[model samples]
Target: SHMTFVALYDYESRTETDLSFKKGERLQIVGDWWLARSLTTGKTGYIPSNYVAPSD
Candidate 1:
């Protein structure tokens, strides 16, 4: 139910509500703050807009 985004780099969450991602991981972009869900982990949080690009 959300647009997909691809991580361009590995990331570690700065806090519990922040997002972490691995390179090439698929994510769902939704809500404010560029918050997204990790497709593989089913976890949701905020990711940097500069670090990701949209995809199918």
Candidate 2:
């Protein structure tokens, strides 16, 4: 089970393991670097904890 989160800032993947996301994009927390999936692209990878917040 994964929790929903929202990106606070735009982030481009620095490596294949990293997840790229845009500001205001929604994501699913999978697992820190925290594992998550981009709701927009349906791709899973690592994302910075500071870049996202638990969705309200």
Candidate 3:
């Protein structure tokens, strides 16, 4: 079986993890970003906040 990444578009209620993110959630600066939980285990487990450019 395949893994479920996000919900279908036609659903009435949407979850935070449903991948419906807004522009307000993005980092405005080149290096600035806000931290959020990928797995959420006591302020741990770091992941990328933005996409790295092909040269970086």
Candidate 4:
């Protein structure tokens, strides 16, 4: 099972392998390099660990 997290800052993906997300958005961690999927967009890719926080 994957854990949920919340975006802490806006992130504009610079590569096709990365996912873009905005503050307050929710996502799920999928693998290493902090790969994750945007809950609203249903898109999966790499995301910055510093830009998100574990959801309570």
Candidate 5:
């Protein structure tokens, strides 16, 4: 199941599997690797699961 969270760090898209986001951004959980959609840009890609925490 998908969920939402806030990114705690900045991630640059360095690889095909990597997704980019700034700190404190809201995102949707889409994959086990933290693949997600940016609430700010509406773009979807991969994010490191460790960078974000589930919204409270």
Candidate 6:
């Protein structure tokens, strides 16, 4: 599959979380998404902000 790489997210989910990757450090995920717990703890990571851009 192919896609266009847009700008990186400086702040997402109304600034609920910020790991703000720069342009080069950013990555775009497409296709069926799988879930895994955050390595640091037994919690999930919010990679995308639904309010900002609803995942289709």
lDDT of 6 at 47: 47
Give the top-scoring candidate (TM-score): 2
TM-score of each: 0.84, 0.88, 0.18, 0.86, 0.81, 0.23
Model 5 lDDT at residue 19: 73
Residue 27's lDDT in candidate 3: 19
lDDT of 3 by residue, 1-56 (tens): 12111111222214333222322232121222233322212222122334211121
Off by over 4 Å in 6: 3-14, 30-56
lDDT of 1 by residue, 19-53 (tens): 88899998898733688889989999998888888
Give the alpha carbon lDDT tens digit for every residue of 1-56 in model 2.
Answer: 33899999999899979999999999998724898889999999999998898886
Candidate 5's residue-wise lDDT over 1-56, tens digit each? 33988899887888886679999898987645767899888889888888898875
Report how far off residue 54 is in candidate 3 (Å). Answer: 18
Backbone-clash count (model 1): 0
Question: Which model is ahead, 2 or 6, in terms of lDDT?
Answer: 2
Model 2 scores a C-alpha lDDT of: 0.89
Candidate order by lDDT, decreasing, is: 2, 4, 1, 5, 6, 3
Cα deviation in Å at residue 18, candidate 2? 0.2
lDDT of 6 by residue, 1-56 (tens): 22213223443323444333323222333222222222223333344432122212
Weakest lDDT window of 10 consecutive positions for candidate 2: 29-38
Better candidate by TM-score, 2 or 5? 2
Ranking by TM-score: 2, 4, 1, 5, 6, 3
Q: Residue 1 deviation, candidate 3, in Å?
A: 22
Task: State, as a TM-score between 0 and 1, how close model 3 is to the true structure.
Answer: 0.18
Model 3 RMSD in angstroms = 13.7
Winner on TM-score between 4 and 6 is 4
Query: Candidate 4: deviation at residue 50, Å?
Result: 0.9
* RMSD versus native structure for model 4: 2.1
Candidate number with the higher TM-score (2 or 4): 2
Give the per-residue Cα lDDT of candidate 3 at 20: 25
Candidate 3 ranges beyond 4 A from true positions: 1-31, 44-48, 51-56
